[PDB]
Design a protein around this ligand. Structure first.
Ligand SMILES: Nc1ncnc2c1ncn2[C@@H]1O[C@H](C[C@@H](N)CC[C@H](N)C(=O)O)[C@@H](O)[C@H]1O
Ligand SMILES: Nc1ncnc2c1ncn2[C@@H]1O[C@H](C[C@@H](N)CC[C@H](N)C(=O)O)[C@@H](O)[C@H]1O
Lengths: 230, 247
């Protein structure tokens, strides 16, 4: 069913800039790239334009058909560089390994906690040694802000100072679309720091976290996370 | 080892050698909830047996027992149950006999008994990840009698207390708090002391409204949510949630 918000029928771009941010933090890419939950190629087409060879993994049959149709419209050199694969980013086996594994924010926020461990484990099995796992992650106002530290003085007779902070971990992005004269959606919104803690917990060293602007200009509303297997 | 907080980092540099970094839940030279217990009592008003989940060493249980309540207290840790059993042995035989102690996992438990009231505290539900909480909710449903209540206390952070900020554009967007990490750093008000022990800890801190969404999704009707102060006065730092099975 639909979500009845406080101000309420449910609600259900260009990846050139986001794609380039990925290309900056990989450097030179010897070998094919695995993109997880590729959708209809919002990022995959920009990746192919960088000359990459991409294996694009997507769960939906319907979304795959849209992707395949788009590929048929592309020049032969583009299409020839894209291998489409039906699969589940939280649990896949292609038997092959890759120098680079890529996932966008819209995709990782699709997975709950247990499914994310599925994802992390699967990526470990598909990275060649010295391989790079790259993630973009949306960063909310709360996730970017320094947490407000609270102080309290407390006795017993021995006096103590208690400091408390609250670190962002997960929010819900709630939407209400409106004819200005009733559409609705709640989605998960992980703090990049949360995903990074999860990455470390699951085996990775996180070597860089670079904020960037998704649309290539203005406020930096995303983070590129580079993770590697030690 | 322990969580090395930003404030801990700078203290330990500034203290040189007197300084030791510890987690709050270990070597601890550093419990009363008669007021939280009263919030529960105030929102029950009782027919029969009460199930208390993750009862710990009875910080709420003993207060409940003092009200005439028959309490089943469920706890996972055997050492904690041992310490509960000791306290319960030093208690008047009227208190001692209205208390049943059971070892169990509040995420997947099963008793040969149903209850008019089931209670859990914030400290406790935040013990559980998302999957385990679903296990909790399902298990609780199975232990409620017709018309029985599930009562939860939930700590409420500043971000959880605020009305989420909107950005009108018409497009209404809100970011609702779901889960935070509560991070503490505790040290003596002095600086000498010796040893200078800095105590840190990180725990899960769910938004009361997130738990409410989760309860509703699990098949409960949430029929009230009441903010209250855990120290009977000051900022209301806690919410009392009441849930029932729709009949
Ligand atoms: N478990 C899963 N495995 C693989 N793909 C998934 C899974 N769950 C959801 N998806 C897909 O993840 C995608 C998420 C979308 N936001 C599209 C992302 C796409 N990279 C884009 O930029 O538009 C959808 O295309 C879903 O069909
Ligand atoms: N899965 C579980 N089932 C039952 N008890 C648990 C579980 N996980 C943790 N605990 C206990 O939950 C308690 C949490 C504590 N904050 C104590 C709660 C107690 N009501 C008090 O106010 O002191 C500890 O006693 C843990 O041993």
């Amino acid at each position: 069913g639909p979500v009845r918000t406080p101000h309420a029928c449910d609600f259900y771009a260009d990846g050139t800039s986001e794609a380039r941010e990925f290309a900056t933090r990989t450097g030179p890419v010897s070998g094919p790239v695995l993109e997880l939950a590729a959708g209809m190629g919002r990022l995959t087409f920009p990746f192919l334009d960088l000359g990459w060879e991409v294996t694009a993994l997507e769960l939906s049959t319907s979304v795959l058909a849209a992707f395949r149709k788009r590929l048929a419209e592309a020049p032969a050199d583009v299409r020839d560089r894209c291998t489409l694969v039906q699969g589940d980013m939280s649990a896949f086996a292609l038997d092959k390994r890759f120098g680079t594994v890529v996932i966008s924010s819209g995709s990782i926020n699709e997975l709950d906690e247990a499914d994310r461990r599925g994802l992390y484990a699967s990526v470990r099995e598909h990275l060649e040694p010295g391989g790079k796992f790259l993630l973009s992650l949306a960063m909310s106002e709360a996730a970017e802000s320094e947490p407000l530290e609270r102080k309290q003085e407390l006795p017993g007779g021995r006096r103590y100072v208690l400091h408390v902070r609250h670190l962002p971990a997960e929010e819900i992005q709630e939407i209400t679309i409106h004819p200005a004269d009733v559409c609705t959606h709640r989605r998960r919104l992980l703090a990049p720091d949360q995903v990074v803690r999860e990455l470390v917990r699951s085996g990775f060293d996180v070597i860089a976290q670079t904020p960037f602007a998704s649309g290539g200009a203005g406020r930096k509303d995303m983070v590129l996370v580079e993770a590697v297997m030690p």
